[PDB]
């Protein structure tokens, strides 16, 4: 049981923030069955923007990875994700999907 605040995986450093997230699933696969639990995914699952600042555009780089990590050509065996949110309305349409 991986317990993960969604707002402590974002660093200052440039795409370290995405490096952590890929590892998190790669750990999971290797300890399978495993569960990834993300609390408050308004943080990095926010709306699309792309008229924000540098800070918000950073969020796009980590979100875009996490979306592909869940479904790509890489399949998940018994890796299961429970996300929790206080509003499904301000989550990304691609995530919510």
């Amino acid at each position: 049981f991986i317990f993960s605040p969604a707002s402590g995986i974002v660093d200052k450093y440039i795409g370290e923030s995405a490096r952590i997230i890929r590892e998190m699933f790669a750990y999971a696969k290797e300890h399978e069955p495993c569960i990834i639990f993300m609390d408050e995914v308004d943080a990095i699952g926010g709306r699309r923007f792309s008229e924000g600042t540098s800070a918000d555009r950073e969020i796009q780089r980590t979100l875009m990875e996490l979306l592909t990590q869940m479904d790509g050509f890489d399949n998940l065996g018994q890796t299961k994700i429970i996300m929790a949110t206080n509003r499904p309305d301000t989550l990304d349409p691609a995530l919510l999907r």
């Binding site: 450093y13 440039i14 795409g15 370290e16 995405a18 490096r19 890929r22 792309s50 008229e51 555009r57 796009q60 780089r61 875009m64 990875e65 979306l67 592909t68 479904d71 790509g72 050509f73 399949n75 349409p93 691609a94 999907r97």
Partner: protein, 148 residues
Amino acid sequence: SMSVALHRHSNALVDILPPDSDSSISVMGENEKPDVTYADVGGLDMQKQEIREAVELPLVQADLYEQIGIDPPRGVLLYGPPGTGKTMLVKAVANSTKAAFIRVNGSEFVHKYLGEGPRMVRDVFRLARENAPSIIFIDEVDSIATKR
């Protein structure tokens, strides 16, 4: 532009490496390709025909494009709302062509060290050229192609 080996204490090109070495990426499909054929996809028959003529057809019959004298389709862009099966339609051609098919995300090309993003961009092209004809798929290219 190719990888090459340098001697640490002087900076000199002391030998050369083949264009396969020095990539973080590799050609998958050895047994790592999905099972999703043309058959597995349901409809979108217009999108199928269109994308097969975009990607598959230039390779199998280059000769026809040259003959007729038409510009072959180069880069492919797939737009449409999320949840339409964009990625799945490309899954199909990854099995079907039986050429090289690379794999790559847009976050493979961002990195912690600076200017080590560009060095990957050069790597994926060089690898594609060697084991050509090749298809490179950048899954989500959103973060590279930002407009601001």
